[model samples]
Target: PFTREDRIGVCKGIFRTDNVADDDIVKLVDTFPGQSIDFFGALRARVYDDEVRKWVSEVGVDTIGKKLVNSKEGPPSFEQPKMTIDKLLGYGGMLVQEQ
Candidate 1:
């Protein structure tokens, strides 16, 4: 769902977190001629796929992420690390002693 240019601009220049700051885009808008939505305001031609990001950021954009299945919670339940060491080697196990 993520792209390179939008996600990896010059290693961190556009949408790469380190690249675009809130203030940076505001300045971009200021640099835009006359403050309009024409090509001048956009700086580049809009692509049909580009619209995907506009709404994708809001919702229905995970594709495989939005958590549709197996979205349960918690970690190693039955044989968790802390108090379950015995169970780890006891049931379905080896030492078969000290029961």
Candidate 2:
């Protein structure tokens, strides 16, 4: 019953598969080193205006990343790379406020 609950409800699908489920995101946040749902929201994304859905599509891993996560190729996984978390933390640091 908080602001981000509504925010996630309103916009979860914008950056994820239609079937990944809310619990999956929760697990992601739980694994995160700290509490920053704002950063979490900022880090997640999917879909593309043209071309292809790089990280959203089922096989985008092989397309964007050299690694393929399928059974024959992957190491039995269920998450995307941690690149976005690093990106989010970088942006969050650069945009910090000061006086």
Candidate 3:
């Protein structure tokens, strides 16, 4: 069984995608069984009102076509990006409280 934290992480990943549908949102919430409220809240927090309106107004075919074209560019290459110890520590500090 997935924990509350795990569900939040999964919902975050789903929201980060370019194309998302109403059914997709429903399915995500449904998967958590008794934790629907928590799942919905997490998903809702990550998604903005403007983004929801945009999805509702746009045609599915147009969205899919754009996604296909965008995907053709290939996955992101992180070779050029470099992370220093200061940056790494900054991220860790967010997850870990001050001692």
Candidate 4:
């Protein structure tokens, strides 16, 4: 469960929060490109060993991918970020938690 502080931390990391109005949140939601399973699945396959790959594969497509905003709209891009298991899983896990 996320606390107010956690959400505030999220807002701080991602948004311009000075006087960030409620509508800003709404707009952010609206701007978010719907999340995709493809991104996560691909990352998982790239990161894990065959054994761990099977395990992480069960993590589910929904658990991986961009969550905050769509890459199409020029939101924060993760395209060229590190492809290590830690990087992929870390990002995917964060998205799952966000959802």
Candidate 5:
């Protein structure tokens, strides 16, 4: 049986994404170097509003020629860019909080 003591001992990190360190953000920015302000703005908008996510979905489909992942499993796995900055970082390259 579970005990109240066990529950009381649990603690959560400030960020929703587990294991997100400052280095991870640096890596994200580096991975997407030359990224457009529009893309950054779109990401920020998605964080702020559902409507923006819808819009980003539309834009990504129209411009990138692909649909955003809609299932729980997430976006279809694909070959990582062979020459991306993530590759330069060695193992665990993408630094994704969740795999």
Candidate 6:
């Protein structure tokens, strides 16, 4: 099970970085079983500010093509990449310190 901190970190990375694509976000939510709420919540928290909102608003379809993993072929078809813990960690930074 993914911890809240994990969700927060991953979502923050997704929301904050221009590297992420809109379709990627959908894939992320769909790929994860029950983490969409956490992902969206983290995004909402970050975008509460007008400046942040404006920054994120710039991430639109027209400009996100290059950022997508499979942009040329459009969204992923049958064979979606596996979502492993290491992959998620790679996508999201390790925010939590040693406990």
Query: TM-scores for all candidates?
Result: 0.21, 0.29, 0.23, 0.22, 0.26, 0.25
Q: Which sections of candidate 2 miss by over 4 Å?
A: 1-17, 46-99
* Sliding window of 10 residues with minimal summed lDDT for model 3: 75-84
lDDT of 6 by residue, 1-92 (tens): 66655655565464553444545554555455454555454433433443444545454543477565555544322332343444444343
lDDT per residue (tens digit) for residues 1-99 in model 4? 654444434533443423445454343333333434343343345443444545445444324443434333322322322333334345555555546
Q: Note the clash tally of each candidate.
A: 0, 0, 0, 1, 0, 0
Return whichever of 2 and 6 wins on TM-score.
2
Candidate 6: how many backbone clashes?
A: 0
Q: For residues 1-99, could you state the per-residue lDDT of candidate 2 as single tens digits?
A: 445464555435544654445665444444443444455454443212111333346455454454433344542233553434444344345433320
Which residue pairs collide, candidate 3?
A: none
**Rank by TM-score, descending?**
2, 5, 6, 3, 4, 1
The RMSD of every model to the true structure, in order and in angstroms, is 24.5, 10.4, 14.6, 17.4, 15.4, 13.8
lDDT of 3 by residue, 1-99 (tens): 776566655655545443444444445544544644443444343344435455555545555776977855433322211223343233334423432
User: Over 4 Å off in model 3, which ranges?
Assistant: 1-19, 46-99
Q: What's the true lDDT of residue 6 in model 4? A: 47
- Candidate 5 CA-lDDT value: 0.38
Identify the leading candidate in terms of TM-score.
Answer: 2
State the displacement of the C-alpha of residue 56, model 2, in Å, after optimal TM-score superposition. 14
lDDT of 1 by residue, 1-99 (tens): 433333232223322322345444444434332323332212222222344455555344343443666554432222212212232223212212322
Local distance difference test values of all predictions, in order: 0.32, 0.44, 0.45, 0.41, 0.38, 0.46
Which window of ten consecutive residues has the lowest lDDT sum in model 1? 76-85
Most accurate candidate by lDDT? 6
Residue 79 lDDT in model 2? Answer: 51
Q: How does candidate 2 score on lDDT?
A: 0.44
